[PDB]
Amino acid sequence: QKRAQIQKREELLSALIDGTSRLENKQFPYPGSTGLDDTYMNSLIQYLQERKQIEDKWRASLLKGIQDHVL
Amino acid sequence: QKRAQIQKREELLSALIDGTSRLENKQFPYPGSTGLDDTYMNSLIQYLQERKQIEDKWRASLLKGIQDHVL
Amino acid sequence: QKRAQIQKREELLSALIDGTSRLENKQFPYPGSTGLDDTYMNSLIQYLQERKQIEDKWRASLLKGIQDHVL
């Protein structure tokens, strides 16, 4: 049914919008006056680690949408 | 109209091709003989910061294409 | 033909599944008790360098799929 096929298309768009928005709204951490200190480097690493998770969910969501013929 | 629906499909493909090509053609900076010096680390950080921007535009373009039924 | 159009849709899905799975299954390297030592920083850099390659192939595969009307 579309009952399912709209559940799928809705799921997908909501997931992709959520993902896209959270990814793009995150500020990239660039060093300030303290340079490449331990605080800075942690912030960079934590940024990359979080971004991985959200990117990975985003691609997975897209692929599922492609597999399920939702787009 | 397709006047719009081709404007949309054309926009999209051009944007995605531009993005894809700029992302893939960028060389990943790996340390050389000077190791993890301040020059190297800046080059890595600037690479990541730029790549974020282009990746974020690319995903946004794709999502818009999905939302507008252009693909 | 679909002979080609299924070759294309099959190629694509297999490529995207391969890519997605390899990206998401890779553990993000976060520093341990030794901190930001040269071993750690190499592991981070090698992670990013590999991830670039696989991400870039994944996007290229997707775009080709969009261009060839396979999805």
Helices A38-67, C2-25: axis angle to 10 degrees equals: 150
Measured between alpha carbons, how far is C52 from C22 in angstroms, rounded to an integer?
Answer: 12
* Domain CATH code at residue C20: 6.10.250.2770
Q: Which residue has the tokens 């390659």?
A: C53
Is C20's CB within 8 Å of A63's CB?
Answer: yes
Burial state string for A21-58 with b = 16 or more CB within 10 A and e = fewer than 16:
eebeeeebbebeeeeeeeebbeebbebbeebbeebbbb
Token pair for C59: 């996007």
φ and ψ of A40, to 5 deg: -60, -50
| Block residue for tokens 């008790």 | C33
For residues B63 and C3, give the distance between their C-alpha atoms in angstroms, rounded to a whole number.
Answer: 30
One-letter amino acid for residue C8 of the chain? K
Which residues have C-beta within 8 Å of that of residue B24, sequence separation ≥ 6? C56, C59, C60
Return the sign of the alpha-carbon dihedral for residues B44, B47, B53, B55: negative
Rounded CA separation B27/C12 (Å)? 25
Contacts of A58 in chain B (CB under 8 A): 59
- CB B28, CB C49: distance < 8 Å: yes
Cβ contact, residue pair C23, A56, below 8 Å: yes
Longest dimension (CA), chain C: 58
Resolution of the structure, angstroms: 1.6
Query: Which residues of chain B have a CB within 8 Å of the CB of A30?
Result: 45, 49
> CA A5 → CA A8, A9, A69, C58, C70, distances in Å?
5, 6, 9, 26, 20
Interface probe with A: pick from C28, C36, C44, most Cβ of A within 10 Å: C28
Backbone angles phi, psi at C70, to 5 degrees: -75, -20
For residue B70, the distance in angstroms to the closest alpha carbon of chain A comes to 10
- CA-based nearest residue in chain C for residue A39: C36
For B61, C33, C52, the CA distances from C12, given in Å and listed in that order, are 20, 42, 19
Q: Print the domain residue range for C35.
A: 1-71
Residue of C nearest to B61 (CA): C63
DSSP state of A26: S
Alpha-carbon distance A28 to nearest alpha carbon in chain B (angstroms): 6
Token look-up 């950080």 returns: B45
Backbone angles phi, psi at A31, to 5 degrees: -60, 145
Residue with tokens 């993005």: B19
Helices A38-67 and A2-25: crossing angle in degrees, nearest 10, is 160
3-state secondary structure chain B: CHHHHHHHHHHHHHHHHHHHHHHHHCCCCCCCCCCCCHHHHHHHHHHHHHHHHHHHHHHHHHHHHHHCCCC
How many structural domains does chain B have? 1
Q: Which residue of B has its CA nearest to A45?
A: B45
Which residue from B minimizes the CA distance to C49? Answer: B28
The pair of structure tokens assigned to B40 is 């190297």
Q: Which of chain C's residues have a Cβ under 8 Å away from the Cβ of A52? A: 28, 51
Q: What is the DSSP track for chain C?
A: -HHHHHHHHHHHHHHHHHHHHHHHHSPP----TT-S-HHHHHHHHHHHHHHHHHHHHHHHHHHHHHHTT--
